[PDB]
Amino acid sequence: KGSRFISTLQVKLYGREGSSARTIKATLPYIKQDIPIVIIFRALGIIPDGEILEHICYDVNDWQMLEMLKPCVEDGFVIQDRETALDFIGRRGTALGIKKEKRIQYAKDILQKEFLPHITQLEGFESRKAFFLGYMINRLLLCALDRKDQDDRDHFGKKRLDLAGPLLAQLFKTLFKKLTKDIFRYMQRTVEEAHD
Amino acid sequence: EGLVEYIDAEEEESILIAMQPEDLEPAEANEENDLDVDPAKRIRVSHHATTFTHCEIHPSMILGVAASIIPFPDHNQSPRNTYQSAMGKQAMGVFLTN
């Protein structure tokens, strides 16, 4: 019920089978670079490692699971605090110093709006979006170890059909909205005069 | 009244659909190699699982609007069935009464 804001997210995994360090990063909409998952969790509001791993892995037994995460942890000892966890998330241009608090107030609502717009887009949810981002990771890995196959793409029930209805919507929405700021553009020219 | 349930592709994953209502759960004879059957009748895989949840309406219903025009589609090499499907749609007839 919110137009068509296709804001896309990607969890990556660096280095192929047998590489050195298998560092895990992510595509975050409106930011220039891929950003290590640990910093992302911190920037949310889960600060300590080993609780970090409680949104990700779900059985504190299966160790290969846990072992795969080592290098991610060792990537984010450079960032440990609620505050500057959003500092890294700051590089998308140059604030030029002028926006030091305001780049947070940029990074703050980027993790309100663009990051996982479903689940909710409200203010006071963070543990909703973590457990999920912690569920994107349990899948990613729970494949690399080769415990379940790659996801099929010709599967039918995992595609949809834009019938005539939502077609019209995806159109009417657009047109109505265009009519909507035609009135706005006629109002700025009223008073000015009266009128009637 | 709970007899039919609208089943989606995904949900299709967790179900075990029977094929023929009658001959997919009667009793055992067994019939696989025992005297006697009709030589000329085709060879049905059988029912070998017996834990079903659903049951198929009628097979023929996998077909489409032009495909059901074919008679005995299951005796033709597929492309023949598909090939016709394209022509039923340039064939000539009663396209509306008005």
Binding site: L163, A164 | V4, P21, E22, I57, M61, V65
Partner: peptide
């Protein structure tokens, strides 16, 4: 006898019932 199950033919009546209802462009209408 109303107890006994469907069989061969009976399957078809269920079909007709369906089309009697939704007709044929149901999706496009719906």
């Amino acid at each position: 006898d109303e107890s006994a199950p469907i069989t061969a033919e009976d399957s078809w009546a269920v079909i007709s019932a369906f089309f009697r209802e939704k007709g044929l462009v149901s999706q496009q209408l719906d």
